[PDB]
Amino acid sequence: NKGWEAALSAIEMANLFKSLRGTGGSGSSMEIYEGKLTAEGLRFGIVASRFNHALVDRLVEGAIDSIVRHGGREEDITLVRVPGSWEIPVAAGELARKEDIDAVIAIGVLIRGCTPHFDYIASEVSKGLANLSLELRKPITFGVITA
Amino acid sequence: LEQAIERAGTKHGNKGWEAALSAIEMANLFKSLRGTGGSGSSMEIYEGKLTAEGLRFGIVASRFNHALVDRLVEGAIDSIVRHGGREEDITLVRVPGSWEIPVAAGELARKEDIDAVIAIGVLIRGCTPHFDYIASEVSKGLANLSLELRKPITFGVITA
Amino acid sequence: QAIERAGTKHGNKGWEAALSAIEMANLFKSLRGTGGSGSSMEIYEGKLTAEGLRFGIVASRFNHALVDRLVEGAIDSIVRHGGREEDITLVRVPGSWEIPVAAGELARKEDIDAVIAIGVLIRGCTPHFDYIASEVSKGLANLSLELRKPITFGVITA
Amino acid sequence: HGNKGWEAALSAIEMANLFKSLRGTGGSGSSMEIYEGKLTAEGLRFGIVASRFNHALVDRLVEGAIDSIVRHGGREEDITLVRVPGSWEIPVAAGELARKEDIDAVIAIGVLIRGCTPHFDYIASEVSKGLANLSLELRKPITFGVITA
Amino acid sequence: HGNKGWEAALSAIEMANLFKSLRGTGGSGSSMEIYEGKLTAEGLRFGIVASRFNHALVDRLVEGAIDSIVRHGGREEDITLVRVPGSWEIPVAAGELARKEDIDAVIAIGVLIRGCTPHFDYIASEVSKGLANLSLELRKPITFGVITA
Amino acid sequence: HGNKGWEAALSAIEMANLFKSLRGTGGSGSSMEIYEGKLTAEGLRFGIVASRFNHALVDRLVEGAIDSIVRHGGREEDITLVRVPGSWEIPVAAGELARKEDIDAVIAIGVLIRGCTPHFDYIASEVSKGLANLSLELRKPITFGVITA
Amino acid sequence: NKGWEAALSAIEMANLFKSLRGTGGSGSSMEIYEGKLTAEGLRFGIVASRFNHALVDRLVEGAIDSIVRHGGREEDITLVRVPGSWEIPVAAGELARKEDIDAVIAIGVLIRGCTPHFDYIASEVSKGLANLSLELRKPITFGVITA
C-alpha cells in the first residue's frame, strides 16, 4: 500500500525540520541531524483525488492508519477532495500555506505511463508539487500511483 | 430541419461538460477553505458544492476545427446553467490557435470578477511518438498561472 | 468513524438514483406550468437544483454493511446539489418484499416530490427466474403511473 | 427459532408499528426524521393463512408463527387462523382477512413444488403476484413466506 | 430510412389519422367498411420522449424521427420533445405528455443493454409493459421505438 | 443485528451456560436428560480478539459483539478486548486469553482475503486449524467468525 | 518489501505480550489491551533461507532496517542461516526456546503455488511455524513469499 509508505515519510519530515529550527550541539563531535518515527503533537494534511474510486479509497485509509498507529492524533488530520489529478497542485498550495499544518500528503491515481501524450498531464502534477516544497519550505509527499 | 437536428444533440458526455463541472466544485472549495475553521472534536473534511448561483466563469476557446470546438463550448455553457448558474455571469474569449491560450487566460484570471477559468482546445497529429513542443507549452502555461494567482483553472483538451 | 467517512461515495447506484429524482422533480414542475412561446420546438429538461425540494428514501435493512454505502450516497447527492438536509424522510424495511408497500405511503403524501428505493438482491446458484426480484420491480413501476409521481429504482445483485 | 415461520412472523409485528407511526403525528424539523418499526407486539391483531399440502412441514411453520407473536408480547385471543387446501387458493383467502378492519397484518404460509423445467411455474407465479397486489390496493402489510420442496 | 427511428415515426402519423376516422360518423354502407390511415402529418401534434443513456446511438434515432415527419408534410412547430435520464422512467414521462389534450400521439425512443444471458430481464420488460398498458387506458396510440444493444 | 459479529457473540453466551450445567450436578433418571445452553449472559466473562486488517469492516463487527453481550444481560466491566495486526496472529493471541481462569469464552473476529487459486490458502488454513486445537486442549469454547472479502 | 511488514509485526507482539504479563486496570471501564510501535529494549531473532540469493537478501535488509528505525538496537539482533525452506521450522524452534529472545522472524522464498505437488513442501513450513507459536507461547512471524 503506497498510502502507508507515503504517509510514513510525512512524520519523519516534521520531526527533522523541527530539529533544524532548534539548536544543535556545541561542536566536539560530528554534528548529525535525524528524524524519529513519532507522530505525537504533529499536524497533517491530506489531498486525494476522486477518479478511480476503487483504487483511491484504500490508499486514503492507509494514510490515516499510518498516523494513528505511530502515536498521532486523528483530531489533527485535514482531508481535502478534488475532482481529478489535475487539481492536486492548486489545492495543495492553498492547504500548505496554513501556519498550523506541518506536512501535506498527496494521493492520486494515473492511468498511463507508456506514452508521451499522457505525460503532459502526469509531469505537471509532479512538477507543481516539487516547486511548492521549495517555495513554501514545507515538506510535501508524492504518493500517487499509476495503473 | 438542420436547426432541429443540431439542437437536439446532447452535450452531456463531451469533455466540455466535465471541464465546466470541475470548475464549479473547485470554486466553492476555495470559498470554504478561506472561511472560518471548524469547531474541533472531529476530523475535518472539505468538499465543494455544485451550486453555480452567484459564481462567475470565463471560457477560452480556439478556432481550429470550428465544427468540433463549438460543440465543446456549448457543453461548457450548458453545465453552468444546468446547476443554477446565471447566463449573464459567463465570459467567452476566442483565440486563433492553441499556442496563445495561456496568455489569453492570464488576463481573465487576474480579474477580480472571475472565480474560475475553463480552457477548451483541440490538438493536431496526436498519433505520433515524438515529443510535441506546442502541446507541452500550452499545458505548462495553464499550470503555472493557477499556482501563481491561486485561482483554479480547468484544462480540457482532446486530440484528433 | 472517520475512516468510514473518508471512503468515497461518488458514482455508486445511490448517487445515480438520487440524481434522477432531482431532475424529474423539476421536470414535472415545468410541465405543471404554462406552455412556451410557441415559436419553435419545445424541449424540456429538468434542472439539477434541489433547493426547496423534498425527497423520501426507502431502504432495506438486509445486508446492513453494504446498504449504508448506497443510502449515504443518495443522501450526499441531495445536499451536494443544493438540497436541504431537513427535507429528507428515511424509512427502513427488513427485505425487498416490503419496498413497494412502503414506497406507496410516502408517494401518496402531497409533501413528497420524489421517492428513491434502495435495496439488494440475492443471487442463487443458478440463473433461474426469481419471483421476489421480479415482483419488486413491477410494484414500483405500477405505483409511479398510478400516483403521477416519479420513483427511482436503484438496486444491485450480490 | 430458525424456521422461515419465525422470520415471516417478525416482519408482521414491526410493520404494524411502522405504519402506525407513519400516518400518525408529524415531525417538527431540526433533523431528518427516521421511521423504524418496534418489535413490541402488544395491542396488535394478526391473521394467518396456511396450506394443507405437506402437512408435516406446514404444522411446524404454523406453530412457529404463534410462538413468535406471543413471545414478543402478543396475545392468542387476537390471532386468527385460516387453512386452505393448496397454494393456488392463498391469495383469495388472504384478501378476505385483509379487508377486515380488525386485522392489522396478514401472514401467508405455504409449501411449493418443483416444476419439470426451469420455465415459469404458473401456480408459483400467481400466488406471489396476487399477494403483492392485495397489499398495494388495501394498504395493509402482507408477509410472503414459502419453501420449495 | 434504414434506422428504426424512420419506421417508428411514420406509424404515429397513420395511426393518428386512423383514430380520426373512427371518432367520426359511419359510412354509406352497401359494402364492407375498410378504415384506412393516411401518410399525411398536416395538423397533427406529436410528442417525443428519448433517453440520455448511450448518447452515440439515441441522437441518430431522434433526428431520424424528425426527418420522417417533416418529409411527410409535418409542421415544425407542433413537435414537442422531452428527455429522460434512463430507460426505466420513460413511461412516466410519456404519461404526463400523453394525457395532454393538445397531444395526439407519443413517440418513445430508448436503448436497452444486450443481456440475453439470463432467462428474463427486470428492466426491459417493465418499460414495454408500462407503455402498452398506458395506451389502452388513455385510448391514445403510443409507438415503441426501443432497440436493444 | 444481522452481522456475523452478532451471530458469533450469541454462541459464546450459550456455551458458557451449557458447559456450566454439563459438569455440574447429575441427573436422577426417570427420563432422558436434555442439556441446552441458556441465553442469559449475567455473571459471565468474555474475551475478544480482532484483526486490524480492513479496519472499516472490523470495527462494525466488534461493536456488534459488545452490543449483543450487554443486551442479553452482560456487563462491560467483564469483557476484554485484544487487537492483533493480522489473521495469522489470532491463534497465538487467543491462546493467552483462554489460559486465563477468569475468562469463560473467547471470540475471534477477523477478515480474510481471496487467494489467487482455488487451492488451499496456507494463512487461511492455519488460523482455523489453530483455534480448534486450542479449544480441545484447554476445554474452553472458542468462536470462529470470519468473512472473506 | 514483505521484510519490512513481517518485521514490523514482531515489535508490536513483544509490547502486547509484555502488557499481558503485567496487571491491568482496576475495572471502572472497558479494559483493553494494545501494543505500541516502539522497539526499545526488545530482542529479536531472524531465520532466513539460502535459496534464491537475489530475492532473499533484499528481504533480510528490510528486517534489520525496520528494527533500527523504530527505536531498536542492532546489538540485540540474532541471524541464523539455513540451506533451504524445509529447515526453517526446525531452526526456528531451537532459536525460540532461548529465554532472552522475545520474537522470531522467518524469511524465505517459495517457487510455486499453483500445484498440489509443491504444496507438500509449502504446507509443512507454515504448519510447523504455527504449532511452535502455540506450544512455546512465543510470537513467530510468517514472512515468506512466493514467486
PDB file of N, CA and C in Angstrom, chain A residues 49-128:
ATOM      1  N   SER A  49      -7.579  12.509  -4.791  1.00  0.00           N
ATOM      2  CA  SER A  49      -8.383  12.680  -5.989  1.00  0.00           C
ATOM      3  C   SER A  49      -9.663  11.851  -5.903  1.00  0.00           C
ATOM      4  N   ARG A  50     -10.557  12.081  -6.864  1.00  0.00           N
ATOM      5  CA  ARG A  50     -11.845  11.402  -6.903  1.00  0.00           C
ATOM      6  C   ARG A  50     -11.926  10.326  -7.979  1.00  0.00           C
ATOM      7  N   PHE A  51     -11.140  10.443  -9.047  1.00  0.00           N
ATOM      8  CA  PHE A  51     -11.153   9.444 -10.107  1.00  0.00           C
ATOM      9  C   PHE A  51     -10.634   8.109  -9.585  1.00  0.00           C
ATOM     10  N   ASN A  52     -11.139   7.018 -10.170  1.00  0.00           N
ATOM     11  CA  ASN A  52     -10.788   5.648  -9.788  1.00  0.00           C
ATOM     12  C   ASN A  52     -11.106   5.400  -8.309  1.00  0.00           C
ATOM     13  N   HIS A  53     -12.413   5.394  -8.030  1.00  0.00           N
ATOM     14  CA  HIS A  53     -12.902   5.257  -6.660  1.00  0.00           C
ATOM     15  C   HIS A  53     -12.432   3.961  -6.012  1.00  0.00           C
ATOM     16  N   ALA A  54     -12.333   2.885  -6.796  1.00  0.00           N
ATOM     17  CA  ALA A  54     -11.984   1.586  -6.228  1.00  0.00           C
ATOM     18  C   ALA A  54     -10.533   1.548  -5.762  1.00  0.00           C
ATOM     19  N   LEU A  55      -9.664   2.341  -6.392  1.00  0.00           N
ATOM     20  CA  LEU A  55      -8.242   2.287  -6.069  1.00  0.00           C
ATOM     21  C   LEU A  55      -7.852   3.360  -5.061  1.00  0.00           C
ATOM     22  N   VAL A  56      -8.426   4.558  -5.191  1.00  0.00           N
ATOM     23  CA  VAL A  56      -8.007   5.688  -4.362  1.00  0.00           C
ATOM     24  C   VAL A  56      -8.391   5.466  -2.905  1.00  0.00           C
ATOM     25  N   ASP A  57      -9.581   4.906  -2.664  1.00  0.00           N
ATOM     26  CA  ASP A  57     -10.128   4.858  -1.309  1.00  0.00           C
ATOM     27  C   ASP A  57      -9.250   4.038  -0.370  1.00  0.00           C
ATOM     28  N   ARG A  58      -8.719   2.909  -0.845  1.00  0.00           N
ATOM     29  CA  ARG A  58      -7.881   2.079   0.015  1.00  0.00           C
ATOM     30  C   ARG A  58      -6.548   2.752   0.321  1.00  0.00           C
ATOM     31  N   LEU A  59      -6.084   3.646  -0.556  1.00  0.00           N
ATOM     32  CA  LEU A  59      -4.851   4.376  -0.281  1.00  0.00           C
ATOM     33  C   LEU A  59      -5.066   5.441   0.785  1.00  0.00           C
ATOM     34  N   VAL A  60      -6.260   6.036   0.826  1.00  0.00           N
ATOM     35  CA  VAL A  60      -6.544   7.066   1.823  1.00  0.00           C
ATOM     36  C   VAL A  60      -6.590   6.461   3.220  1.00  0.00           C
ATOM     37  N   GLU A  61      -7.207   5.283   3.358  1.00  0.00           N
ATOM     38  CA  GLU A  61      -7.322   4.655   4.674  1.00  0.00           C
ATOM     39  C   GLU A  61      -5.952   4.331   5.257  1.00  0.00           C
ATOM     40  N   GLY A  62      -4.984   4.002   4.401  1.00  0.00           N
ATOM     41  CA  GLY A  62      -3.632   3.777   4.883  1.00  0.00           C
ATOM     42  C   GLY A  62      -2.995   5.034   5.447  1.00  0.00           C
ATOM     43  N   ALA A  63      -3.346   6.195   4.890  1.00  0.00           N
ATOM     44  CA  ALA A  63      -2.758   7.451   5.346  1.00  0.00           C
ATOM     45  C   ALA A  63      -3.169   7.770   6.779  1.00  0.00           C
ATOM     46  N   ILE A  64      -4.463   7.649   7.085  1.00  0.00           N
ATOM     47  CA  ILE A  64      -4.919   7.887   8.452  1.00  0.00           C
ATOM     48  C   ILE A  64      -4.414   6.790   9.383  1.00  0.00           C
ATOM     49  N   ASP A  65      -4.411   5.539   8.911  1.00  0.00           N
ATOM     50  CA  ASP A  65      -3.957   4.430   9.746  1.00  0.00           C
ATOM     51  C   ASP A  65      -2.486   4.572  10.114  1.00  0.00           C
ATOM     52  N   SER A  66      -1.667   5.078   9.189  1.00  0.00           N
ATOM     53  CA  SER A  66      -0.249   5.268   9.478  1.00  0.00           C
ATOM     54  C   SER A  66      -0.041   6.276  10.601  1.00  0.00           C
ATOM     55  N   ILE A  67      -0.821   7.359  10.601  1.00  0.00           N
ATOM     56  CA  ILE A  67      -0.635   8.414  11.592  1.00  0.00           C
ATOM     57  C   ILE A  67      -1.058   7.935  12.978  1.00  0.00           C
ATOM     58  N   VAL A  68      -2.225   7.291  13.073  1.00  0.00           N
ATOM     59  CA  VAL A  68      -2.776   6.952  14.382  1.00  0.00           C
ATOM     60  C   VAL A  68      -1.965   5.844  15.051  1.00  0.00           C
ATOM     61  N   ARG A  69      -1.496   4.862  14.275  1.00  0.00           N
ATOM     62  CA  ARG A  69      -0.753   3.757  14.871  1.00  0.00           C
ATOM     63  C   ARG A  69       0.645   4.181  15.298  1.00  0.00           C
ATOM     64  N   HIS A  70       1.171   5.261  14.721  1.00  0.00           N
ATOM     65  CA  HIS A  70       2.504   5.747  15.044  1.00  0.00           C
ATOM     66  C   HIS A  70       2.495   6.789  16.158  1.00  0.00           C
ATOM     67  N   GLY A  71       1.424   6.854  16.944  1.00  0.00           N
ATOM     68  CA  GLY A  71       1.337   7.781  18.052  1.00  0.00           C
ATOM     69  C   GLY A  71       0.651   9.093  17.750  1.00  0.00           C
ATOM     70  N   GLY A  72       0.129   9.275  16.539  1.00  0.00           N
ATOM     71  CA  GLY A  72      -0.535  10.507  16.179  1.00  0.00           C
ATOM     72  C   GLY A  72      -1.953  10.585  16.710  1.00  0.00           C
ATOM     73  N   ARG A  73      -2.575  11.737  16.469  1.00  0.00           N
ATOM     74  CA  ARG A  73      -3.939  12.003  16.905  1.00  0.00           C
ATOM     75  C   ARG A  73      -4.799  12.296  15.687  1.00  0.00           C
ATOM     76  N   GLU A  74      -5.981  11.679  15.634  1.00  0.00           N
ATOM     77  CA  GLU A  74      -6.861  11.836  14.482  1.00  0.00           C
ATOM     78  C   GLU A  74      -7.516  13.210  14.434  1.00  0.00           C
ATOM     79  N   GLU A  75      -7.436  13.986  15.517  1.00  0.00           N
ATOM     80  CA  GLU A  75      -8.072  15.298  15.537  1.00  0.00           C
ATOM     81  C   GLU A  75      -7.317  16.308  14.683  1.00  0.00           C
ATOM     82  N   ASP A  76      -6.050  16.040  14.383  1.00  0.00           N
ATOM     83  CA  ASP A  76      -5.207  16.977  13.652  1.00  0.00           C
ATOM     84  C   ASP A  76      -5.127  16.678  12.160  1.00  0.00           C
ATOM     85  N   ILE A  77      -5.922  15.745  11.658  1.00  0.00           N
ATOM     86  CA  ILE A  77      -5.877  15.355  10.254  1.00  0.00           C
ATOM     87  C   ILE A  77      -6.911  16.153   9.473  1.00  0.00           C
ATOM     88  N   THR A  78      -6.474  16.749   8.366  1.00  0.00           N
ATOM     89  CA  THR A  78      -7.341  17.502   7.471  1.00  0.00           C
ATOM     90  C   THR A  78      -7.332  16.842   6.100  1.00  0.00           C
ATOM     91  N   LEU A  79      -8.521  16.640   5.534  1.00  0.00           N
ATOM     92  CA  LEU A  79      -8.669  15.946   4.262  1.00  0.00           C
ATOM     93  C   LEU A  79      -9.415  16.840   3.282  1.00  0.00           C
ATOM     94  N   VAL A  80      -8.884  16.950   2.066  1.00  0.00           N
ATOM     95  CA  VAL A  80      -9.473  17.752   1.000  1.00  0.00           C
ATOM     96  C   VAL A  80      -9.659  16.863  -0.221  1.00  0.00           C
ATOM     97  N   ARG A  81     -10.840  16.929  -0.828  1.00  0.00           N
ATOM     98  CA  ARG A  81     -11.161  16.150  -2.014  1.00  0.00           C
ATOM     99  C   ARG A  81     -11.145  17.037  -3.254  1.00  0.00           C
ATOM    100  N   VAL A  82     -10.612  16.493  -4.344  1.00  0.00           N
ATOM    101  CA  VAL A  82     -10.524  17.212  -5.615  1.00  0.00           C
ATOM    102  C   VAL A  82     -11.114  16.344  -6.716  1.00  0.00           C
ATOM    103  N   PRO A  83     -11.626  16.971  -7.784  1.00  0.00           N
ATOM    104  CA  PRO A  83     -12.243  16.175  -8.863  1.00  0.00           C
ATOM    105  C   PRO A  83     -11.279  15.229  -9.560  1.00  0.00           C
ATOM    106  N   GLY A  84     -10.164  15.742 -10.080  1.00  0.00           N
ATOM    107  CA  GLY A  84      -9.229  14.931 -10.829  1.00  0.00           C
ATOM    108  C   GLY A  84      -7.809  15.125 -10.336  1.00  0.00           C
ATOM    109  N   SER A  85      -6.880  14.452 -11.019  1.00  0.00           N
ATOM    110  CA  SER A  85      -5.470  14.552 -10.662  1.00  0.00           C
ATOM    111  C   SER A  85      -4.867  15.894 -11.054  1.00  0.00           C
ATOM    112  N   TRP A  86      -5.517  16.633 -11.954  1.00  0.00           N
ATOM    113  CA  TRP A  86      -5.001  17.927 -12.383  1.00  0.00           C
ATOM    114  C   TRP A  86      -5.089  18.977 -11.283  1.00  0.00           C
ATOM    115  N   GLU A  87      -6.014  18.821 -10.338  1.00  0.00           N
ATOM    116  CA  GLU A  87      -6.289  19.843  -9.338  1.00  0.00           C
ATOM    117  C   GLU A  87      -5.530  19.640  -8.034  1.00  0.00           C
ATOM    118  N   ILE A  88      -4.674  18.619  -7.941  1.00  0.00           N
ATOM    119  CA  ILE A  88      -3.881  18.430  -6.723  1.00  0.00           C
ATOM    120  C   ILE A  88      -2.894  19.569  -6.478  1.00  0.00           C
ATOM    121  N   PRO A  89      -2.080  20.015  -7.457  1.00  0.00           N
ATOM    122  CA  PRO A  89      -1.120  21.097  -7.148  1.00  0.00           C
ATOM    123  C   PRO A  89      -1.754  22.390  -6.657  1.00  0.00           C
ATOM    124  N   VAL A  90      -2.892  22.791  -7.227  1.00  0.00           N
ATOM    125  CA  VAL A  90      -3.513  24.047  -6.815  1.00  0.00           C
ATOM    126  C   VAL A  90      -4.141  23.910  -5.431  1.00  0.00           C
ATOM    127  N   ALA A  91      -4.712  22.741  -5.127  1.00  0.00           N
ATOM    128  CA  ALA A  91      -5.314  22.536  -3.814  1.00  0.00           C
ATOM    129  C   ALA A  91      -4.250  22.369  -2.736  1.00  0.00           C
ATOM    130  N   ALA A  92      -3.143  21.698  -3.065  1.00  0.00           N
ATOM    131  CA  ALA A  92      -2.074  21.503  -2.090  1.00  0.00           C
ATOM    132  C   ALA A  92      -1.416  22.825  -1.718  1.00  0.00           C
ATOM    133  N   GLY A  93      -1.240  23.717  -2.696  1.00  0.00           N
ATOM    134  CA  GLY A  93      -0.625  25.004  -2.410  1.00  0.00           C
ATOM    135  C   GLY A  93      -1.450  25.852  -1.462  1.00  0.00           C
ATOM    136  N   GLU A  94      -2.772  25.858  -1.648  1.00  0.00           N
ATOM    137  CA  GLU A  94      -3.644  26.584  -0.731  1.00  0.00           C
ATOM    138  C   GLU A  94      -3.613  25.971   0.662  1.00  0.00           C
ATOM    139  N   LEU A  95      -3.562  24.640   0.741  1.00  0.00           N
ATOM    140  CA  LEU A  95      -3.558  23.972   2.036  1.00  0.00           C
ATOM    141  C   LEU A  95      -2.228  24.146   2.760  1.00  0.00           C
ATOM    142  N   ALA A  96      -1.118  24.177   2.019  1.00  0.00           N
ATOM    143  CA  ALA A  96       0.197  24.217   2.652  1.00  0.00           C
ATOM    144  C   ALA A  96       0.515  25.590   3.232  1.00  0.00           C
ATOM    145  N   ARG A  97      -0.146  26.644   2.747  1.00  0.00           N
ATOM    146  CA  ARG A  97       0.147  27.986   3.238  1.00  0.00           C
ATOM    147  C   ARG A  97      -0.399  28.230   4.638  1.00  0.00           C
ATOM    148  N   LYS A  98      -1.230  27.330   5.159  1.00  0.00           N
ATOM    149  CA  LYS A  98      -1.715  27.468   6.525  1.00  0.00           C
ATOM    150  C   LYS A  98      -0.576  27.252   7.514  1.00  0.00           C
ATOM    151  N   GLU A  99      -0.525  28.099   8.543  1.00  0.00           N
ATOM    152  CA  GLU A  99       0.562  28.037   9.512  1.00  0.00           C
ATOM    153  C   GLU A  99       0.447  26.835  10.443  1.00  0.00           C
ATOM    154  N   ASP A 100      -0.768  26.336  10.680  1.00  0.00           N
ATOM    155  CA  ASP A 100      -0.946  25.236  11.622  1.00  0.00           C
ATOM    156  C   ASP A 100      -0.463  23.909  11.048  1.00  0.00           C
ATOM    157  N   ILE A 101      -0.595  23.714   9.741  1.00  0.00           N
ATOM    158  CA  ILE A 101      -0.267  22.439   9.114  1.00  0.00           C
ATOM    159  C   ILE A 101       1.242  22.314   8.951  1.00  0.00           C
ATOM    160  N   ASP A 102       1.768  21.130   9.279  1.00  0.00           N
ATOM    161  CA  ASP A 102       3.197  20.865   9.199  1.00  0.00           C
ATOM    162  C   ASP A 102       3.614  20.058   7.978  1.00  0.00           C
ATOM    163  N   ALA A 103       2.734  19.221   7.433  1.00  0.00           N
ATOM    164  CA  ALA A 103       3.084  18.406   6.277  1.00  0.00           C
ATOM    165  C   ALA A 103       1.840  18.180   5.431  1.00  0.00           C
ATOM    166  N   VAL A 104       2.066  17.936   4.141  1.00  0.00           N
ATOM    167  CA  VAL A 104       0.992  17.726   3.177  1.00  0.00           C
ATOM    168  C   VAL A 104       1.245  16.420   2.437  1.00  0.00           C
ATOM    169  N   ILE A 105       0.201  15.599   2.338  1.00  0.00           N
ATOM    170  CA  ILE A 105       0.263  14.309   1.661  1.00  0.00           C
ATOM    171  C   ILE A 105      -0.683  14.338   0.469  1.00  0.00           C
ATOM    172  N   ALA A 106      -0.178  13.938  -0.696  1.00  0.00           N
ATOM    173  CA  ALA A 106      -0.948  13.932  -1.932  1.00  0.00           C
ATOM    174  C   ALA A 106      -1.167  12.497  -2.389  1.00  0.00           C
ATOM    175  N   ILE A 107      -2.419  12.164  -2.705  1.00  0.00           N
ATOM    176  CA  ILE A 107      -2.802  10.827  -3.140  1.00  0.00           C
ATOM    177  C   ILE A 107      -3.546  10.938  -4.463  1.00  0.00           C
ATOM    178  N   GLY A 108      -3.184  10.078  -5.408  1.00  0.00           N
ATOM    179  CA  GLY A 108      -3.831  10.089  -6.707  1.00  0.00           C
ATOM    180  C   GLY A 108      -3.507   8.827  -7.474  1.00  0.00           C
ATOM    181  N   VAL A 109      -4.178   8.679  -8.614  1.00  0.00           N
ATOM    182  CA  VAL A 109      -4.006   7.526  -9.492  1.00  0.00           C
ATOM    183  C   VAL A 109      -3.848   8.022 -10.923  1.00  0.00           C
ATOM    184  N   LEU A 110      -2.828   7.517 -11.612  1.00  0.00           N
ATOM    185  CA  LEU A 110      -2.562   7.858 -13.001  1.00  0.00           C
ATOM    186  C   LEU A 110      -2.916   6.666 -13.882  1.00  0.00           C
ATOM    187  N   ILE A 111      -3.418   6.946 -15.090  1.00  0.00           N
ATOM    188  CA  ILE A 111      -3.980   5.888 -15.927  1.00  0.00           C
ATOM    189  C   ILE A 111      -3.006   5.330 -16.956  1.00  0.00           C
ATOM    190  N   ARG A 112      -1.895   6.011 -17.226  1.00  0.00           N
ATOM    191  CA  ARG A 112      -0.987   5.553 -18.268  1.00  0.00           C
ATOM    192  C   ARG A 112       0.407   6.100 -17.994  1.00  0.00           C
ATOM    193  N   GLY A 113       1.416   5.313 -18.359  1.00  0.00           N
ATOM    194  CA  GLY A 113       2.795   5.729 -18.200  1.00  0.00           C
ATOM    195  C   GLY A 113       3.700   5.275 -19.328  1.00  0.00           C
ATOM    196  N   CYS A 114       3.118   4.944 -20.481  1.00  0.00           N
ATOM    197  CA  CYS A 114       3.905   4.422 -21.592  1.00  0.00           C
ATOM    198  C   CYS A 114       3.603   5.177 -22.883  1.00  0.00           C
ATOM    199  N   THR A 115       3.326   6.478 -22.777  1.00  0.00           N
ATOM    200  CA  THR A 115       3.128   7.303 -23.964  1.00  0.00           C
ATOM    201  C   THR A 115       3.434   8.765 -23.657  1.00  0.00           C
ATOM    202  N   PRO A 116       4.074   9.482 -24.586  1.00  0.00           N
ATOM    203  CA  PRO A 116       4.317  10.918 -24.363  1.00  0.00           C
ATOM    204  C   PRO A 116       3.045  11.743 -24.253  1.00  0.00           C
ATOM    205  N   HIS A 117       1.932  11.265 -24.817  1.00  0.00           N
ATOM    206  CA  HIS A 117       0.706  12.060 -24.848  1.00  0.00           C
ATOM    207  C   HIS A 117       0.160  12.293 -23.446  1.00  0.00           C
ATOM    208  N   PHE A 118       0.101  11.238 -22.633  1.00  0.00           N
ATOM    209  CA  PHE A 118      -0.397  11.379 -21.273  1.00  0.00           C
ATOM    210  C   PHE A 118       0.664  11.922 -20.324  1.00  0.00           C
ATOM    211  N   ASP A 119       1.929  11.959 -20.752  1.00  0.00           N
ATOM    212  CA  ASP A 119       2.981  12.526 -19.918  1.00  0.00           C
ATOM    213  C   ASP A 119       2.790  14.018 -19.679  1.00  0.00           C
ATOM    214  N   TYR A 120       2.010  14.698 -20.523  1.00  0.00           N
ATOM    215  CA  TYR A 120       1.739  16.115 -20.304  1.00  0.00           C
ATOM    216  C   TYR A 120       0.981  16.333 -18.999  1.00  0.00           C
ATOM    217  N   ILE A 121      -0.039  15.512 -18.745  1.00  0.00           N
ATOM    218  CA  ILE A 121      -0.799  15.632 -17.506  1.00  0.00           C
ATOM    219  C   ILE A 121       0.034  15.163 -16.319  1.00  0.00           C
ATOM    220  N   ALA A 122       0.754  14.052 -16.486  1.00  0.00           N
ATOM    221  CA  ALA A 122       1.464  13.444 -15.364  1.00  0.00           C
ATOM    222  C   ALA A 122       2.638  14.302 -14.904  1.00  0.00           C
ATOM    223  N   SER A 123       3.331  14.953 -15.842  1.00  0.00           N
ATOM    224  CA  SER A 123       4.524  15.716 -15.483  1.00  0.00           C
ATOM    225  C   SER A 123       4.180  16.926 -14.622  1.00  0.00           C
ATOM    226  N   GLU A 124       3.110  17.646 -14.971  1.00  0.00           N
ATOM    227  CA  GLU A 124       2.790  18.877 -14.255  1.00  0.00           C
ATOM    228  C   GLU A 124       2.284  18.602 -12.845  1.00  0.00           C
ATOM    229  N   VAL A 125       1.726  17.414 -12.603  1.00  0.00           N
ATOM    230  CA  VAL A 125       1.329  17.046 -11.247  1.00  0.00           C
ATOM    231  C   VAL A 125       2.558  16.926 -10.354  1.00  0.00           C
ATOM    232  N   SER A 126       3.601  16.259 -10.851  1.00  0.00           N
ATOM    233  CA  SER A 126       4.828  16.122 -10.074  1.00  0.00           C
ATOM    234  C   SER A 126       5.627  17.421 -10.064  1.00  0.00           C
ATOM    235  N   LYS A 127       5.631  18.145 -11.186  1.00  0.00           N
ATOM    236  CA  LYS A 127       6.382  19.394 -11.262  1.00  0.00           C
ATOM    237  C   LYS A 127       5.810  20.448 -10.322  1.00  0.00           C
ATOM    238  N   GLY A 128       4.481  20.542 -10.246  1.00  0.00           N
ATOM    239  CA  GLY A 128       3.868  21.541  -9.385  1.00  0.00           C
ATOM    240  C   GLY A 128       4.114  21.282  -7.910  1.00  0.00           C
TER     241      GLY A 128
END
